[PDB]
Amino acid sequence: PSGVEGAAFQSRLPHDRMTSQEAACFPDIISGPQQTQKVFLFIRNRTLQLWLDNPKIQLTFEATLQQLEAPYNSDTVLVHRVHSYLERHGLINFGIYKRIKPLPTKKTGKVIIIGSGVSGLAAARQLQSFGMDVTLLEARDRVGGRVATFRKGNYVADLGAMVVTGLGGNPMAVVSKQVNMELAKIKQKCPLYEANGQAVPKEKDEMVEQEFNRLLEATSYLSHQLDFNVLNNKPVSLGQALEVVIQLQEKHVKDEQIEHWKKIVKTQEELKELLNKMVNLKEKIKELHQQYKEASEVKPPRDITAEFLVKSKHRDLTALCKEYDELAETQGKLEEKLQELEANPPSDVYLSSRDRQILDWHFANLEFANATPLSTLSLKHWDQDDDFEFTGSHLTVRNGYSCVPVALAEGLDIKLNTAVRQVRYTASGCEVIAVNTASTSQTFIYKCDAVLCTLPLGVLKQQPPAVQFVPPLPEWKTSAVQRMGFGNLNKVVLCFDRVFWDPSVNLFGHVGSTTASRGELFLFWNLYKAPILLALVAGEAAGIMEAISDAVIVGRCLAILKGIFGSSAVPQPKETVVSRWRADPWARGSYSYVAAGSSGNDYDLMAQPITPGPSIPGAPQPIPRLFFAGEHTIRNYPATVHGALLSGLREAGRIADQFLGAMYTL
Amino acid sequence: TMQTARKSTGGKAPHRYRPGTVALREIRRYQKSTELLIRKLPFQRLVREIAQDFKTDLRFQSSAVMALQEASEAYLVALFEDTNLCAIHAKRVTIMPKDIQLARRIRGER
Amino acid sequence: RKPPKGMFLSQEDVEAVSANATAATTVLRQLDMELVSVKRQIQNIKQTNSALKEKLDGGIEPYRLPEVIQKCNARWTTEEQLLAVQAIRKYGRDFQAISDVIGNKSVVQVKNFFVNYRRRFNIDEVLQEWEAE
Ligand SMILES: Cc1cc2nc3c(=O)[nH]c(=O)nc-3n(C[C@H](O)[C@H](O)[C@H](O)COP(=O)(O)OP(=O)(O)OC[C@H]3O[C@@H](n4cnc5c(N)ncnc54)[C@H](O)[C@@H]3O)c2cc1C
């Protein structure tokens, strides 16, 4: 919508209702009259609207009260408390913006952030804007973490992050209004060519996609209704459920065949009993035909009572011949049915290898959106975040998405080439042990009051751990680490010197010959200035394709392009880059995914900080020291870049929740 | 959620009875009982009026009035039976004065 | 939430295929054996009906008599009345049969014959004797 309600929709907040977070901070307003609640909703959403109108400067709080409801002076400094509440938790004044009021020259508190990714950069600048000392420890020689961009001359290609999922409600729209981001829309037209290189007709492509959507509707009702979630004392995946359903449709075809032959043996037996009655009646008619001829040899007036006996046998014969004529009519009706339904049985409608190849492509596309095979996704919670999708079309970054983390790193104190070894947290402070990537013997020690960990979950699940925690994490925390998984996908950059595809088509698909290799080079992309194609590898083959050299992968990419457009129409590429996120020791995979046996509660458990025990026996409850962030710590928006962006804003908002005013002192 | 090309369509999901009921139930109630339906005192005064026009200064035995009431109600109930049959014969359900007049015409009561 | 158009999906079939490692193969083989069984039943019954059709070669064409097309009369003769009496005795209330036996009396005239000559011919006794057989 527009106005106050439109600003609430843009900030993921209900326009006519208060969230649970707004109830815990102001319990007096939500438990009071309804009119006071509406005033709080209006003040919040109006300041949201003022921020969304001008996100490039600091939305102050004195001009907000001055430009709200004429001279508005009927509140005892209530706008101050509400504005400071909203600006801290990242609901209003979200992202990184130029601040009018200067930062405090003396900072309060020291925080070490592990990893300079989107989450590590957002929470850092928020920590710094709040008046705290920040130092980022990055093991890579750059920032962004899982945000990679290949830049060489005029070729731009993103090896990890570039496309978004819309601007409606997404804080990325404000980031695009803040950081110079050229956004280009994605044309959803994606033609499909088989292994031979020829395209798929419209009627065939629409029927396989419709059957693919029908199998996803089977997925929905197997999950939310049949509760098919326990099999052999183990959680049920999805690839098994879909394959069973498909085999049941082949059973439905066989049953339709059997029932069709059952209806034929049924009518054929009716013809059997009908013909047997016709034979028996023909013999009786033949007998009566022999009888009355002897009665005709005598004159009718000669003997007596012949007119009764002759017409009686004549009427009975006439009645039986009339029935035989109607049974002959039914015989003709059954014969024309045995000529109409003989060569047209309603059968022979499976899925075949024709539709299976395209169905394997759709499965690979679904495996790409999750970076894991369908046999690892939980049937119950694989689309648990499917209700929080963003509105609008899908857009890309025309000039590489790395322009965001490089711009967010402006003014921060980031330690590049610094890998963290141990993480010590006690009741009086924290100590981070880190080394230099150029020489592992050089060790660095940083003191701080709190530590924010943005490391991927796949690193913590692997034993031995690459980063040790002292004291070790509790069993419930490590169990949530091991239950969840970490997906994998890769990209292959193909830099050419001339356009040799269809410029108006941004992406085209290539189906696989087999099911095991369905996620092997199934989709290429065109959406940058230079003629560049972006191949996609996913599934179980993705991990195997990483063990293969770059020349073979590019040779397979060229062989597919030559098989579709021709050998002469396909020149040789100039630069080729292949990504290996699983082989990357600083990622150990691609991005998060709901595994079988896990749920959305595990994302919230990753969001919960840990509190170390007291150093002195008998000391009170210490202050929570170690907090985590990243894409795998947010429940509603996992596996995205704004999810990690909101995680940094979340921990930024939890600063005041940790401080909780100055009431506990007196 | 990371579906940017050909998204997965699936995976998203006072009381008043009707006229005629009390009447029929009242019919059943009176067809089971045999109590007199016209009240005794207004009927007794009506008969006294009718008798005054025949002979003056007359006294009635209480049993004489009850016998007059018995024959009168039986005549009227039987007449309404014939009256209801006439109304149903005319493709109607409602009795009308033409039905009683037709019934008394067939009976020969002129 | 609801099975798709022309598609049945029950919990029993899902559990049967995933009963063990070779459950789907067992079900498919049993369905194929049932398909072979119904097909040979088609072949045997088709052979039986072909033989039955071979027995009906010629129809009842040599056993058909021409129609005695004659108008309906109006007078009842003694012969016609007695033929009606005997027709009631054997057929009863089959007016079409009695009309065809007499030949020159339509169905409506036979039905009228029952009423006009009911007592003079004891038709009630003739009908109750037919009902005894
Ligand atoms: C391949 C891929 C493509 C994507 N494409 C898109 C897209 O087109 N559009 C979109 O909207 N989203 C996309 N996403 C989603 C988005 O990029 C991520 O979900 C999100 O950015 C993750 O950010 P993060 O800070 O949590 O992870 P990271 O930023 O990776 O956090 C870890 C960071 O710290 C570094 N690090 C690792 N180990 C250490 C260590 N020991 N010490 C210090 N630093 C360390 C890493 O190098 C990394 O920079 C994509 C994700 C992936 C994986």
Q: Where are the beta strands (DSSP E) in C28-101?
A: none
Instruction: Collapse the DSSP code of C111 into the 3-class scheme (helix H, G, I; strand E, B; otherwise coil) and give the result.
Output: helix
Longest CA–CA separation in chain A, Å: 146
B11 touches chain A (CB under 8 A): yes
Structure tokens at A254: 């066989």
Q: How far apart are CA A380 and CA A68, in angstroms?
A: 47
Tokens for A25, please give them: 């901070």
- What are the chain C neighbours of A258 within 8 Å (beta carbons)? 31, 34-35, 38
Q: Whole-angstrom Cα distance, residue A109 to residue A130? A: 11
Q: How far apart are CA A125 and CA C105, in angstroms?
A: 116
Q: Cα–Cα distance between C91 and C127 in angstroms, integer? A: 9
Using the Cβ of B58 and the Cβ atoms of chain A, whether some distance falls under 8 Å is answered with: no
Cα-based distances in Å from C71 to A90, B91, C84, C95, C99: 107, 45, 17, 17, 12
Residue A195, Cα to own-chain centre: how many angstroms?
27
Measured between alpha carbons, how far is A372 from A23 in angstroms, rounded to an integer?
A: 38
Look up residue A426 and give its two tokens: 């006690």
Q: Which two tokens stand for residue A600?
A: 């959305």
Report in angstroms the alpha-carbon separations of A410 from A257, A407, B39, C62.
70, 6, 108, 111
Nearest CA in chain C to A327: C59
Torsion angle of the four alpha carbons A647, A648, A650, A651, in this order, in degrees rounded to the nearest 10: 120
Give the start-end residues of each E strand in A437-531.
Answer: 443-448, 450-453, 468-470, 485-486, 490-495, 507-510, 523-525
State residue A350 phi and psi, 5-degree precision: -95, -150
A420 lines ligand 1 (CB under 6 A): yes
Ligand 1 neighbourhood includes A400 CB (under 6 angstroms): no
Going from the Cα of A170 to the center of ligand 1, the distance in angstroms, rounded, reads 18
Asked if A541 and A561 count as a contact pair (C-beta separation under 8 A), the reply is no
Contact criterion met (CB below 8 Å) for A129 and A105 = no
Interface contact flag, A219 B11, Cβ < 8 Å: yes
3-state class (DSSP) for residue A151: strand
Instruction: Tell me if A489 CB under 6 Å of ligand 1.
Output: yes
* Residues 6 or more apart in contact with residue A385 via CB below 8 angstroms: A600, A635, A636, A637, A638, B1
- CB count within 10 Å of CB A613 equals 11
CA of A519: how far to CAs of A198, A511, A525, A540, A642, in Å? Answer: 19, 9, 15, 8, 26
The residue of chain B nearest to residue A187, with distances taken between CA atoms, is: B5
Q: Distance of alpha carbon C57 from its chain centroid, rounded?
A: 22
Q: How far apart are the first and last CA of chain A?
A: 45
**Long-range CB contacts for residues C9-14, cutoff 8 Å, separation at least 24:** C9/A218, C9/A221, C9/A245, C9/A248, C11/A226, C11/A228, C13/A248, C13/A251, C14/A222, C14/A226, C14/A228, C14/A241, C14/A244, C14/A245, C14/A248
Q: Is A146 annotated as a binding residue?
A: yes
Nearest CA in chain C to A261: C38
Nearest alpha carbon to residue A355 among A511, A241, A561: A511
Decide the pairing of beta strands A183-185 and A395-397: antiparallel
- Provide the angle, in degrees to the nearest 10, between the axes of the packed helices A641-659 and A78-88: 130
Count CB-CB contacts under 10 A for residue A625: 22
Question: Are the C-beta atoms of residues A450 and A627 closer than 8 Å to each other?
Answer: yes
DSSP state of B50: H
**H helices within A297-387, ranges in order?**
306-340, 352-368
Tally C-beta pairs within 8 A across A and B.
64
- How far is the centre of ligand 1, averaged over its atoms, from the C-alpha of A462 (Å)? 18
- The helix, strand and coil proportions of chain A, stated in percent and rounded to the nearest 5, come to 40, 15, 45
Quick one: chain B helix, strand, coil %, rounded to 5?
A: 60, 0, 40
Residue A147 in contact with residue A160, Cβ under 8 Å?
yes
- Dihedral of CA atoms A50, A53, A59, A60 in degrees, nearest 10, equals -50
Sign of CA dihedral A237, A239, A245, A251: negative
The H or E element that residue A217 is part of is: helix A202-224
> In testing the pocket of ligand 1, which one of A146, A158, A489 has its CB within 8 Å of the most ligand atoms?
A146
Which of A362, A386, A639 is closest, CB to CB, to B12?
Answer: A386
How many Å apart are CA A517 and CA A511, to the nearest integer?
9
Pick from C24, C48, C102: CB nearest A272: C48
Q: Is the CB of A115 under 6 A from ligand 1?
A: yes
Q: Is the dihedral of CA A31, A36, A42, A48 positive or negative?
A: negative
Q: Between A and C, how many CB-CB pairs are < 8 A?
A: 116
**What is the CA angle A237-A241-A243, rounded to 5?**
120
CA-nearest residue to B6 within chain A is A188
Which residues in chain A are contacts of C101 at CB distance < 8 A?
307-308, 311-312, 315
- The answer to whether the annotation marks A162 as part of a ligand binding site is yes
Sequence-distant (6+) residues with CB within 8 A of C100 are: A311, A314, A315, A318
Picking from A165, A224, A359, A603 by the largest number of B CB atoms within 10 A of its own CB, the best residue to mutate is A165
Q: Is A640 annotated as a binding residue?
A: yes
Resolution (A): 5.0
A159 with A493: CB under 8 angstroms?
yes
- Residue A347, exposed/middle/buried by CB under 10 A (0-12, 13-18, 19+)? middle
> Long-range contact list for A658-666, CB < 8 A, 24+ apart?
A658/A623, A658/A624
Report d(CA A116, CA A415) in Å as an integer.
9
Q: CA nearest C85: which of C120, C51, C49, C53? A: C120
Residues from chain A that touch B5, judged by Cβ atoms under 8 A, are 186, 188, 190, 365, 394, 507, 523
Could you tell me where the beta strands, DSSP code E, fall in A430-515? 430-436, 443-448, 450-453, 468-470, 485-486, 490-495, 507-510
**Contact (CB<8Å) A249/C7:** yes
The amino acid occupying position B75 is Y
Nearest to A251 among C27, C45, C63 (CB): C27
Experimental technique, in short, is X-ray
CA of A118 to the centre of ligand 1 (A): 7
What is the dihedral sign for C-alpha A97, A98, A101, A104? positive
